[PDB]
C-alpha cells in the first residue's frame, strides 16, 4: 500500500528511472498515531520478525524528571504550548517528541517541602498556617534546625521556577516517542532552554 522505497524517485543528474520489480513487503509504511490528550487508549501491532509495537491514541498522564534536583514522579499532562515543526499540531493538540507541554506542579512541591522543611508555592499566611504546618515543624531530637544546614544552605530555587510554582503548572519537554513506545515521558524546562521557549511562546502570541 503505502511504501518507503528509494526507486520511485529520480537520480543526481535529474534523469528518470523505470521500475525494477513490484512492491515488496519489507518496503512497507503505515498511518500516523496522532496522539491526543485524554483517558488512556492504546493499540498494538505485529511487526517484522513477529515482535510487538505499542501505539498510543490518547494519554492523560506521564513520567517527568526535574534533573536539577534528582527528582522524578508520575504527573498529569494539562496542555500543549509550542511545537517547532508545525502550528497545526498545537491548534489540534497532538503529542510528539520534543513537543512543549504544561504539567501539574504538585508532586515536586510535596517532595521539596518535606525534604527541605521550607514552603515553596505559598502566597500569604492563610495558605501556610491552618493545616499541614506539621509537615514543616515536628519534635526532632538533635536534628531540629542547625543540622538542616545540610539542606537550608542549598535550598534556593531559580526565580523562573518560583514564578511557575505559584500558578500550579510547570513547562516540560517530551523525550519518548509516544506513537512507538505507548508512553509520554520527559523532563522539566530549566535555565537557557526555559528562556528560549518563553521568548518563542511570547513572540508568537501575547
Amino acid at each position: 500500500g503505502i511504501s518507503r522505497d528509494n526507486w520511485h524517485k529520480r537520480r543526481k543528474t535529474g534523469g528518470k528511472r523505470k521500475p525494477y520489480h513490484k512492491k515488496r513487503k519489507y518496503e512497507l509504511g503505515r498511518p500516523a498515531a496522532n496522539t491526543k490528550i485524554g483517558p488512556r487508549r492504546i493499540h498494538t501491532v505485529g511487526v517484522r520478525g513477529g515482535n510487538k509495537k505499542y501505539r498510543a491514541l490518547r494519554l492523560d498522564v506521564g513520567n517527568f524528571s526535574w534533573g536539577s534536583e534528582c527528582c522524578t514522579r508520575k504527573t498529569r499532562i494539562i496542555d500543549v504550548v509550542y511545537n517547532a515543526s508545525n502550528n497545526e499540531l498545537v491548534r489540534t493538540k497532538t503529542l510528539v517528541k520534543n513537543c512543549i507541554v504544561l504539567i501539574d506542579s504538585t508532586p515536586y512541591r510535596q517532595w521539596y517541602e518535606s525534604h527541605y522543611a521550607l514552603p515553596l508555592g505559598r502566597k500569604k499566611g492563610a495558605k501556610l498556617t491552618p493545616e499541614e504546618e506539621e509537615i514543616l515543624n515536628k519534635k526532632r531530637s538533635k536534628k531540629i534546625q542547625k543540622k538542616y544546614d545540610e539542606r537550608k544552605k542549598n535550598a534556593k530555587i531559580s526565580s523562573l521556577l518560583e514564578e511557575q510554582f505559584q500558578q500550579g503548572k510547570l513547562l516540560a519537554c517530551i523525550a519518548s516517542r509516544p506513537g512507538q513506545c505507548g508512553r509520554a515521558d520527559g523532563y522539566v524546562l530549566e535555565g537557557k532552554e526555559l528562556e528560549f521557549y518563553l521568548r518563542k511562546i511570547k513572540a508568537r502570541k501575547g
Partner: protein
C-alpha cells in the same frame, strides 16, 4: 559566534548537562558549557577549532554522532554553494586493451565539511572517509585539508 540558536528548536550537544545548583560567580564568570569531542583513530588528529569552538553540528566526526569505517579517499575541492557540504573532483586513467593506450575519466562526490575547517578554497586537496548514509547523495566526510604539492594562495610568502 556570540549567538548560535538561529533555528526554531533549541540547539545543544547530547550527553552534556548544566547544573542549576552552586550557581554563584561574583563580579565575573566562566563557561557554563563543557565541550564533548573524540579521537577518530587511523592516525588522524582532532583540530584545535573543534575543542576551543562553540558551534553545533550533529554530522561532525570530532564533536557529533558518526563512525569512520571502510575506505579512505582524496580529491580536489571544485564547488561549495551548499551549506556544510562541498563538491570534490576525482580524476583517473582507464586502460583499453585492443590498443595499448589510456583514456582520461572523472567522477564527482558531494561530501560533508564541518566548521573547524574555515579557510578552504577551490583547488585545495582534501581527504575523506566513509560514514553511514548522511543524506540522499552524501556518504563521505572530510578528515583533513591541505595545499601541499602545489602553488600558494596569493604570493610565494604564504
Amino acid at each position: 559566534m556570540a549567538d548560535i540558536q538561529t533555528e526554531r528548536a533549541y540547539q545543544k550537544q547530547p550527553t552534556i548537562f548544566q547544573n542549576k545548583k552552586r550557581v554563584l560567580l561574583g563580579e565575573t564568570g566562566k563557561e557554563k558549557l563543557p565541550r564533548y569531542y573524540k579521537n577518530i583513530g587511523l592516525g588522524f588528529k582532532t583540530p584545535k577549532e573543534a575543542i576551543e569552538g562553540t558551534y553545533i553540528d550533529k554530522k561532525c566526526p570530532f564533536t557529533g554522532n558518526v563512525s569512520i569505517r571502510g575506505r579512505i579517499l582524496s580529491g580536489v575541492v571544485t564547488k561549495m554553494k551548499m551549506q556544510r557540504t562541498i563538491v570534490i573532483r576525482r580524476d583517473y586513467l582507464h586502460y583499453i586493451r585492443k590498443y595499448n593506450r589510456f583514456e582520461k575519466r572523472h567522477k564527482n562526490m558531494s561530501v560533508h565539511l564541518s566548521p573547524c575547517f574555515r579557510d578552504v578554497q577551490i583547488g585545495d586537496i582534501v581527504t575523506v572517509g566513509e560514514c553511514r548514509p548522511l543524506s540522499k547523495t552524501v556518504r563521505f566526510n572530510v578528515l583533513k585539508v591541505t595545499k601541499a604539492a602545489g602553488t600558494k594562495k596569493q604570493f610565494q610568502k604564504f
